[PDB]
């Protein structure tokens, strides 16, 4: 996260760290959606152009974390993966369309002060909240700058951008399965996700029922926090039928 701030304790209790076993390193962000299911970006797991192809045994899930590097004794929980499920129409060849994957944990995680699931939006939530100018919140342990690494979980609040402005900022084809967020040059304020934050949640707090909903997943961007560029996020609601189908079957 570029130009964000340290998270408060328990501020994002659905935050998950995807952690490579060998070598030990941050793979990506992710989010807890029930005691058994974790949501992330497909490209965190599968990206042939970079020869990335992680199998279940290659990584661990770390939940309830604050510190990036510390083993948080009596606080964080470490879970192994039973199965990964990548969207069958994830487009890694071009633009990361449908950048979404689920991971089922081998055993349920116990909820605590530090560990709790986020809600997924329904059609109404999405129509009401996914509006240009409305702000969401992005969290992660990724790079502090485009060109180092944070001590603790970082957080930034960013407005959703009008679709024409998003399209006009890039040569990449933007689909209905994506949205963009970030400040414009003329707005003065700054902030973006960066390398290491992909797969992490973009959340919004409903003013109707005071619950947090995961509206986006950190997908991609061109550099980090550049003027006139915006972060691109997977549209969770648009892909919810696939989410439900996988959880219902598996």
């Amino acid at each position: 996260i570029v130009e964000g701030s340290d998270a408060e304790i328990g501020m994002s209790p659905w935050q998950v760290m995807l952690f490579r076993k060998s070598p030990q390193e941050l793979l990506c962000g992710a989010s807890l959606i029930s005691d058994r299911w974790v949501l992330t970006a497909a490209h965190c797991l599968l990206y042939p152009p970079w020869d990335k192809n992680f199998t279940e045994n290659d990584l661990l899930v770390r939940i309830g974390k604050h510190s990036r590097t510390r083993y948080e004794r009596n606080i964080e929980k470490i879970s192994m993966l039973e199965k990964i499920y990548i969207h069958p129409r994830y487009n890694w060849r071009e633009n990361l369309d449908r950048d979404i994957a689920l991971m089922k944990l081998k055993k349920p995680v116990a909820f605590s002060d530090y560990i709790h699931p986020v809600c997924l939006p329904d059609r109404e939530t999405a129509a009401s909240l996914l509006q240009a100018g409305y702000k969401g919140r992005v969290t992660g342990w990724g790079n502090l700058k485009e060109t180092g690494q944070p001590s603790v979980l970082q957080v930034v609040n960013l407005p959703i951008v009008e679709r024409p402005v998003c399209k006009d900022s890039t040569r990449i084809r933007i689909t209905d399965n994506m949205f963009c967020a970030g400040y414009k040059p003329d707005e003065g304020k700054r902030g973006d996700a960066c390398e290491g934050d992909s797969g992490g949640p973009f959340v919004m707090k409903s003013p109707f029922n005071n619950r947090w909903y995961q509206m986006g997943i950190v997908s991609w961007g061109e550099g980090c926090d550049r003027d006139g560029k915006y972060g691109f996020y997977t549209h969770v609601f648009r892909l919810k039928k696939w989410i439900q189908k996988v959880i219902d079957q598996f």
Binding site: M11, K135, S206, R211
Partner: peptide
């Protein structure tokens, strides 16, 4: 049933330092 309600915030009626910024943006 309890999704999206944080033990250290919503559950105990405490607010984090910047959630108000989000609320203020939700104008319509």
């Amino acid at each position: 049933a309890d999704c999206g309600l944080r033990p250290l915030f919503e559950k105990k009626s405490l607010e984090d330092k910047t959630e108000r910024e989000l609320l203020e943006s939700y104008i319509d």
